[PDB]
Amino acid sequence: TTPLVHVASVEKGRSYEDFQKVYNAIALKLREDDEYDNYIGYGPVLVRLAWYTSGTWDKHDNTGGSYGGTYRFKKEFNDPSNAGLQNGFKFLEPIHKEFPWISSGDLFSLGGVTAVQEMQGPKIPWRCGRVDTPEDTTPDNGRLPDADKDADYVRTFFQRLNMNDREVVALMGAHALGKTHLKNSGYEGPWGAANNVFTNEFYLNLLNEDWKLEKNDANNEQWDSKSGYMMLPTDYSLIQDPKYLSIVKEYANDQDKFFKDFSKAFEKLLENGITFPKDAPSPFIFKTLEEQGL
C-alpha cells in the first residue's frame, strides 16, 4: 500500500557504550571461531548478511531494507540466492541472546560493520534505532541480484537501492572478502588471496590477473585466473563497461579513496529506508578490539 515511514527509535536508555559492548562481543567471537570455512572465519559471511538484508530495499515503496530485521528466505536457505547466509545468523544468535535488547536490524547491520572493521577495513559510522516489524516480513524472493548478468543489469539493479556508478563499484569491492561456494550459489572460488583482510584487492585482481571464461561444475560460467581466483559475470562486467572500468582503476590505484568511498556507500546501504529524527544521536564510530587493547 502507501509507502510507510520508518523512524529510527533508540533502544530504551542505550548509548554508545552499550553498542560498543555488542561490537566487542561480535569481534571477540570472530576471533574465537577462527576455523569456520577453512579458517577464513565468519567475517565475510557477516558482511554478506548485512548486505543481503539491507539489499532487499526498494526505494519506490520503501519496503525491505535493514529497518524491520524481519525476512522470509526462499526455500529456507536452500536456494542458490541465499544459501549460506544461515551461517551468519547462527553466529549472531549467541550475541542476540546476551544482548536481547538490540533490535534484529541493528544486530545484522552492526555485524557487518564489526566484521569490516575487525578485518582491517575502514571505519564505518553506524546508527542505532532500527525496530523489529514482526507483522511485516520481507520475502527475499527475487529482490537480490543475479550473478549471471552484465553491466547494464548491474547498473539498473542498483538504481532500486539508489546507488550510482561509483557507489556500485565501491560496494562490490567487498568481494575481496570470502569466496563463492558451489553448493551455495553455483559458483566456486575466492576473489583473491587474503580472504579475511579488507583491502582493494578485488580491483587489483580484476585488472592484473589473466582471466579465462570457464564453466564450473554447476554448469555456470565464471571468470577464472591461474592464481586460483574467480570473478562472477557481474564482477567482471565492471571492467567490460567503460564507466565502471574507470572507477575500478581509480580504486585499484588509491586504497584510501576506496576505503573512504566504501565506508560512505556501506553506511548508506545499511541506512536506506530509515528516517532519523533531528535529535537522534550522531552516528557511532566504534573502536576495534585492537584499538582498545582487547
| Residues contributing to the site for ligand HEM (CB under 6 A) | 44-45, 47-48, 51, 84, 145, 147, 154, 171-172, 174-175, 177-181, 184-185, 187, 232, 234
Q: State the minimum distance, in angstroms, from the CB of residue 176 to ligand HEM.
A: 8
Residue type for position 73: F
Nearest residue (CB) to ligand HEM, 47 versus 113: 47
Distance (Å, whole) CA 220 – CA 108: 30
Of 6 and 48, which has the nearer Cβ to ligand HEM?
48
- Smallest distance from ligand HEM to CB 171, Å: 4
Least distance in angstroms from the C-beta of 6 to ligand HEM: 21
Q: What does the buried/exposed string (b/e) look like for 114-146 if buried means 16 or more CB atoms within 10 Å of the residue's CB?
A: bbbbbbebbbbbbbbbbbebeeeebebeebbbe
Q: Closest separation between CB of residue 266 and ligand HEM, Å?
A: 6
Q: How far is the CB of 254 from ligand HEM (least distance, A)?
A: 19
Nearer to ligand HEM (CB atom), residue 8 or residue 176: 176
Query: Minimum CB separation from ligand HEM for residue 211, in Å?
Result: 17
Question: Of 11 and 165, which CB lies nearer to ligand HEM in the complex structure?
Answer: 165
Q: Give 131 or 269: the residue with its C-beta nearer to ligand HEM.
A: 269
Across the chain, which distance is largest between two alpha carbons, in Å?
55
Nearer to ligand HEM, 171 or 274 (CB): 171
Contact 138, 56 (CB under 8 A): yes
Which candidate, 138, 136, 116, places its Cα nearest to that of 125?
116
Q: Strand 230-231 to strand 221-225: parallel, antiparallel, or no bridges (unpaired)?
A: antiparallel
Neighbouring C-beta atoms of residue 165, cutoff 10 Å: 17
* Residue tagged 575481496 (cell numbers): 176
The CB-of-11 to ligand HEM minimum distance in angstroms stands at 25
Query: Please, what is the minimum distance in Å from the beta carbon of residue 193 to ligand HEM?
Result: 14
Return d(Cα 79, Cα 183) in angstroms, integer. 10
Of 11 and 146, the one with the shorter C-beta distance to ligand HEM is: 146
For residues 14 and 54, which CB has a smaller minimum distance to ligand HEM in the complex? 54
Radius of gyration of the chain (CA): 18
Neighbouring C-beta atoms of residue 20, cutoff 10 Å: 16
The beta-carbon contacts of 97-101 under 8 Å, at least 24 apart in sequence, are: 98/25, 99/21, 99/22, 99/25, 101/11, 101/12, 101/14, 101/18
Give, in order, the Cα–Cα distances in Å from 244 to each of 45, 126, 157: 25, 27, 14
The position carrying cell 561490537 is: 23
Q: Tell me which residue has its CB nearest to ligand HEM.
A: 178
